[PDB]
Structure 1
Amino acid sequence: MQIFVKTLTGKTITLVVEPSDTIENVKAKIQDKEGIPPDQQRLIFAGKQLEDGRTLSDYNIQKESTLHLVL
């Protein structure tokens, strides 16, 4: 299972994840990739604001889904 996260500049991060990963887990991986602090990261999928303590499965984020970092 992998997902893509686009940064505010449009740069693509590719992450290996599992359905039960939380959004907090994904923020931790983005921080390793790009040095973006988790408290600075806001993620959206399909127009939904994603909360740290919910999982990819809870938002119906599937393989090959793209999340966006936003302001």
Structure 2
Amino acid sequence: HHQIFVKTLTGKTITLEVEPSDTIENVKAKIQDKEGIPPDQQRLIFAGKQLEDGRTLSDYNIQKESTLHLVLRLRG
């Protein structure tokens, strides 16, 4: 396991403990636990990609102390 950072555009950093084989789905569930944001409303971005729920941290080459951007799904 290692840490990653999840950063909002309000300048807030969420630090998560994760494993390489964790899926984005699993990560969004953690973010829900920390910030109460429903996974269906979370958009995570890394390497300019909108990350897919079924892929893993390793799939995206996310590593120790990598940062992911977190923004909300734009409604309306």
Larger Rg computed on CA atoms: 2
Give distance in 2, aligned partners of 1:16 and 1:68. 16
Among all aligned residue pairs of Structure 1 and Structure 2, give the percentage whose two residues are the same amino acid.
99
SS at match of 1:42: strand
Determine helix, strand or coil for the equivalent of 1:13: strand
Question: Offset of 1:9 from its aligned partner?
Answer: 1.7
Where 2:5 maps in the other structure, the secondary structure is strand
- Tell me how large the CA RMSD over aligned residues is: 0.8
Unaligned runs of 5+ in 1: none
Q: Which runs of 4+ in 1 moved over 2 A?
A: none
Unaligned runs of 5+ in 2: 72-76
Instruction: Tell me what 1:12 maps to.
Output: 13
TM-score, normalised to structure 1, is: 0.93
Deviations 1:11-52 (A, max 9, x none): 100000000000001000000000011010000012111000
* Aligned counterparts of 1:29 and 1:18: Cα–Cα separation in 2: 12
1: CA distance between counterparts of 2:56 and 2:9?
22
In the aligned structure 1, how far is the partner of 2:15 from the partner of 2:42? 16
Decide which structure has greater strand share: 2
Q: Provide the aligned length of Structure 1 versus Structure 2.
A: 69
